[PDB]
Amino acid sequence: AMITEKSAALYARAVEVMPGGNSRTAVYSSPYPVYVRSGSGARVTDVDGVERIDFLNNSTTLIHGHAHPEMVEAIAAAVGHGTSFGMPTPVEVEYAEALSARNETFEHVRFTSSGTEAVMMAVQAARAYTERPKIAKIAGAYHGAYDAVAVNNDGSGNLISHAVTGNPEGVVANTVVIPFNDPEGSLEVLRRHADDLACVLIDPVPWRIGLLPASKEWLDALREFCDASGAVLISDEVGSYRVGYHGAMQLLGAEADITVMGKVIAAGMPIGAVAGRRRFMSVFDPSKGKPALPHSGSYNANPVSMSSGIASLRLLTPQAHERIGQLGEQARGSMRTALGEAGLDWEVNGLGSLFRVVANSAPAGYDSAAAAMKALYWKLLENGIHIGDSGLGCISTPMGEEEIAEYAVAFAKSLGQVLAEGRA
Amino acid sequence: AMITEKSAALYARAVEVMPGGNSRTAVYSSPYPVYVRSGSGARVTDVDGVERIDFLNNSTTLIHGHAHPEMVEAIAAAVGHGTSFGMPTPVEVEYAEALSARNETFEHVRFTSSGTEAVMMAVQAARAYTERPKIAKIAGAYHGAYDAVAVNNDGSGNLISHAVTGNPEGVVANTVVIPFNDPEGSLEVLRRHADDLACVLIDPVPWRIGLLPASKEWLDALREFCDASGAVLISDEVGSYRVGYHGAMQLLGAEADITVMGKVIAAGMPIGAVAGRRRFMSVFDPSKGKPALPHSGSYNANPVSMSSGIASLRLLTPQAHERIGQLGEQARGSMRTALGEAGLDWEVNGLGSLFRVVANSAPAGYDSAAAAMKALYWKLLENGIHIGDSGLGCISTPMGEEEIAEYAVAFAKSLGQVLAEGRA
Ligand SMILES: Cc1ncc(COP(=O)(O)O)c(/C=N\OC[C@@H]2NC(=O)[C@H](CON)NC2=O)c1O
Ligand SMILES: Cc1ncc(COP(=O)(O)O)c(/C=N\OC[C@@H]2NC(=O)[C@H](CON)NC2=O)c1O
């Protein structure tokens, strides 16, 4: 039934001017991805004119969905006064005040143009503060393309160093890898490197290794180790921040030294933030002579991203947070029911407005769990739903009971078609 | 004469929620910078309601000046359709076609959210392509905060490794430095590392070491060395692209393997680009199995930045390029006349629409050339002009000969006040 002629035609143009017609690896699909032209509320219209409900929302960025009227007003008005300046603006101060208010530990903030930049500057801040070379990160957790964190970032639980082709030993040797939610196995690695560890970089709810939350026991172990060793505890919440009204660490009963944020904090415009205790952030302070850590960037704190941020945080009320959490719980419950009725051993993980279908046993006619999940992704597209091709989805504030109910129908239908085609 | 009480009040708020009240080192001034609220054409209005002519234009980003009506229309329309998506859009293809058309060597392009990211991904591409660890860069040249290029990036001509506090040996040892416009001195270093060199990273007109162009002799030496060694020649034109209609290397009669771009290519919205021959860019291609170099990012090719880019390149006509070049020549000429009549030995460098006052001999009452230039920056603010605090300025398309004449009057007056206050 699904017509993708206009997507095919865009891809044929794209391959002439981009590598494999791609500018962002995560959005590529074989033989070509669906191209989209517009979004309104919870829905996206593709270039072939097909409207679908968006349950991934630019990889969980769009907490307020597409072209939220209050977001559009704030952003378009900011654009009309100037997109960026070589001078600070009132809105950077207002937005820093708004974000600092969200958690006790967000005492001092700096803005970047991406979570990728923000993770990089948080790592650089820990290295400048401690004057130690090594970082520890979770086996399998993704933190963007910065070479120090683009190590064991592929969802593998293995601790053996595995990096991108060309990432030198000089980088890779200074990133050590700990097992998620294994306190004893983590402390073994951390104690070995204690003298040389600038930071322990975690995601409290990492997507790529199943969207399971960090245990109280594991977070307590890392907090105690960082306190004892002087290593900086960095919580990368670029994705996971949204699980809690005060972020992921606070929800799970822990305190970071530095938190990395992005995505939902501006809900669609380019943003990252480094937010931490004054002493850790003091490496950036240029007011008492040259800073220990210079940090510039043409779009840092640009008033369009700052205005997007102010509007996003204003719309992210405790009531809106609670409501998308309830819709997330309902969505996860309905998916577990549908998977059970279909006879699959697949799990549904997630907190609040986040979920992930984690494919376990490959059904008949699929070479892998991952191939079965890709087939479900394509069947959901055919049945009017966007999710992630490895099972990630999320609730947006424009959604109500009706969108969740429609998702549940499309999910059950799509499972049936995936299984039937595997046996065909 | 100058009232900055509303800037002082914003700074008093800022220091509570940012390190030293700062989110971008380059825009900080002691005791506080001037905060701005709006821009229109060539003019910026500060928070105290004072309108000035902007001659730095967000560090040379705003080639079309502030809130250009055709830019604002294109950006606001894109915002209305959705700020970012987890799917590619028509405008990323249209913008890649427009940017590819600017230079023979821009066969394939990849979009990032900043020049900082684009530099990082160009270096990662060269390392993935060659599977060699080392990069060569210019002594003193700035390329953003990415730790492999945040080495000898402070305007010094010394070849001795000098990096940010905390940047590990593991990074710093794999970045070697060459003397700008010294062919034999550069080849000595390059030939020592030839077997291990992934890339030679240059800026053809580097700001931080005086905004003087690369010589034909030096570019020929590097081009020949890269051809012989297999090292990738990367031209970082994030700042310098605008000197030529086809970019900086083409103006100077040279070809890069990869070009890094940003700033003017979208003229205000967050952007970077990596553009080069298909073979170098093929590491990013995800269409024939897993790519050698994964490269994602939440805002990569976002339709708002792509729409800003389409509008910017449409406005950057050969006629616009010619005219802002005329105004740059007039500005540089007027500054040289004013410096000569004031009895200063300071030089004015630049090509096309870029200029830099390079302070040489400190006049009476100033401890350094840099302190005298900072004083000139403050006096120019008092006299209704924004320039860079180290003497960088540039032309925007809304300017005419009248703005450059007003600048010349303010420049002569400001020199007089700087010298008189030094003798006080
Ligand atoms: C923890 C974390 N840190 C940094 C970033 C990068 O932020 P960005 O430059 O604003 O896109 C991100 C952003 N995106 O990660 C990609 C996202 N996260 C994932 O783990 C999986 C695997 O992706 N490669 N799929 C996804 O779409 C992040 O999640
Ligand atoms: C060659 C080059 N490569 C990369 C970047 C970073 O791009 P961005 O992340 O889009 O701001 C830039 C951007 N800014 O450099 C800062 C600019 N360049 C300079 O050389 C001097 C010295 O730096 N502070 N003053 C400046 O304000 C760049 O010029």
Residue numbers in the entry:
A (entry chain B), B (entry chain A): 0 to 423
Source paper text:
As part of investigations into the C-nucleoside formycin A (8-aza-9-deazaadenosine) biosynthetic gene cluster from Streptomyces kaniharaensis, we have characterised a pyridoxal 5′-phosphate (PLP) dependent aminotransferase (ForI) that aminates a pathway intermediate. ForI is a PLP-dependent enzyme from the biosynthetic pathway of the C-nucleoside antibiotic formycin. ForI possesses the mixed β-sheet and three-stranded antiparallel β-sheet insertion characteristic of the PLP dependent aspartic aminotransferase family. The predicted active site of ForI comprises residues from two monomers, indicating the dimer to be the functional unit.
Incubation of ForI with either d- or l-cycloserine immediately shows changes in the UV-vis spectrum. After incubating the protein at 4 °C with either 10 mM d or l cycloserine overnight, the protein was crystallised at pH 8 with 10 mM cycloserine, crystals were harvested on day 3 and 1.5 Å diffraction data collected (ESI†). Mass spectrometry (ESI†) and unbiased electron density identified the formation of external aldimine PLP–diketopiperazine adducts, that have retained the stereochemistry of the cycloserine enantiomer used in soaking. In each external aldimine complex, the atoms of the diketopiperazine adduct originating from PLP adopt the same positions as observed for the PMP structure. In both structures the diketopiperazine ring occupies the pocket adjacent to the cofactor. In the l-cycloserine derived complex Trp 206 has adjusted its conformation in order to make π-stacking interactions with the diketopiperazine ring. Arg 207 adopts a different conformation than seen in either PLP or PMP structures, in this conformation it makes only a few van der Waals contacts with the adduct. The polar atoms in diketopiperazine ring make a series of hydrogen bonds to water molecules which bridge to the protein. The difference in the rates of formation of the adducts, we suggest would arise from the favourable π-stacking interaction with Trp 206 seen only for l-configured diketopiperazine. The diketopiperazine molecule may thus partly mimic the external aldimine of the aromatic planar heterocyclic ForI substrate and the possibility of π-stack with Trp 206 is especially suggestive.
